[PDB]
UniProtKB/Swiss-Prot annotation:
Changing residue 74 to K: In EDMD2; dramatically aberrant localization with decreased nuclear rim staining and formation of intranuclear foci; distribution of endogenous LMNA, LMNB1 and LMNB2 are altered in cells expressing this mutant; causes an increased loss of endogenous EMD from the nuclear envelope; interacts with itself and with wild-type LMNA and LMNB1; no decrease in the stability compared with wild-type. This is Prelamin-A/C. It is linked to Emery-Dreifuss muscular dystrophy 2, autosomal dominant: A form of Emery-Dreifuss muscular dystrophy, a degenerative myopathy characterized by weakness and atrophy of muscle without involvement of the nervous system, early contractures of the elbows, Achilles tendons and spine, and cardiomyopathy associated with cardiac conduction defects. Emery-Dreifuss muscular dystrophy 3, autosomal recessive: A form of Emery-Dreifuss muscular dystrophy, a degenerative myopathy characterized by weakness and atrophy of muscle without involvement of the nervous system, early contractures of the elbows, Achilles tendons and spine, and cardiomyopathy associated with cardiac conduction defects. The gene is LMNA. In the arteries, prelamin-A/C accumulation is not observed in young healthy vessels but is prevalent in medial vascular smooth muscle cells (VSMCs) from aged individuals and in atherosclerotic lesions, where it often colocalizes with senescent and degenerate VSMCs. Prelamin-A/C expression increases with age and disease. In normal aging, the accumulation of prelamin-A/C is caused in part by the down-regulation of ZMPSTE24/FACE1 in response to oxidative stress.
Length: 74
């Protein structure tokens, strides 16, 4: 037991630090995925909205086309 508390209680010094360093990290990572799952859904909405405009344009495009069918017929 000459240098037992210079090793057993020096092992416990890092187990409180390694547990914590991993934890401060795992959290820092789980925080980053949280925002990333948030951009990844806010972006799906941005697309869903745009598609519903593109579809609404394709609509009129056939109408302006059917209008011309009459206007320009021999």
């Amino acid at each position: 037991l000459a240098a037992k508390e210079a090793k057993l209680r020096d092992l416990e010094d890092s187990l409180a630090r390694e547990r914590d360093t991993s934890r401060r990290l795992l959290a820092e990572k789980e925080r980053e995925m949280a925002k990333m799952r948030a951009r990844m859904q806010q972006q799906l909405d941005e697309y869903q909205e745009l598609l519903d405009i593109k579809l609404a344009l394709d609509m009129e495009i056939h109408a302006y086309r059917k209008l011309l069918e009459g206007e320009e017929e021999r």
